[PDB]
C-alpha cells in the first residue's frame, strides 16, 4: 500500500469526530516493524543475493 511492508496493524477505537458528524467507530492504525527468530533468518540469508532496499557493498548501493 506504500513501498515497504504489505502489513498494517489495527486496533478498534471509539472517538468523537466533529464537523456536523457524531461519534464514530473506526480502526486506528499502529505502525509495524519486521523481525524473525533464528530458524527463519538462516534460510532467507543463504537464499538472498537480490538487490534489496540496500544490501550495502558500495557507495552506489546506498543511493538505491
Amino acid at each position: 500500500k506504500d513501498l515497504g511492508l504489505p502489513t498494517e496493524a489495527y486496533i478498534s477505537v471509539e472517538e468523537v469526530h466533529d464537523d456536523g458528524t457524531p461519534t464514530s467507530k473506526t480502526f486506528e492504525h499502529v505502525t509495524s516493524e519486521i523481525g524473525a527468530e533464528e530458524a527463519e533468518e538462516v534460510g532467507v540469508e543463504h537464499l538472498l543475493r537480490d538487490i534489496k532496499d540496500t544490501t550495502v557493498g558500495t557507495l552506489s548501493q546506498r543511493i538505491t
Binding site: 558500495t58 557507495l59 552506489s60 543511493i63
Partner: protein
Amino acid sequence: QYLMEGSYNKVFLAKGNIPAESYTFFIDILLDTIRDEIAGCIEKAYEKILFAEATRILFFSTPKKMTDYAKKRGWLLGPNNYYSFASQQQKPEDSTIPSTELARQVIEYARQLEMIV
C-alpha cells in the same frame, strides 16, 4: 602603460603632439578616454564618500560634465552620484542558509565517487 598602472597624472598628451603625422587628431578622442577610466575606477573605489571630495579628482567641476559621464556609469543626477553600486557586489559571501548552490558541485563529486568504489 600609465593607464594600466592607474596613473591619471603622468599619462601624457604632449608627447602625442611631438608627431604631427596625424597622431594630432587622435589626442582629440584620447582626452575623452582618460576621463572615462578615472570615472570607472571611482565607482569601484567608494562604498560612499562626499560629492565634494570626488569631483576634484574627476576633474569635473561643472555639473554638466558630471551628468555626461554619469549616464555611462549608471550614476543618477549631476553632483549627486551613487558610487556605491560596485562596492555592494562583494558582500553576499555572508549567506549560508540556502545550501544547494552555496556548497557547489554536490552532484558532480558524488557521481565520480560512486563510480570509483
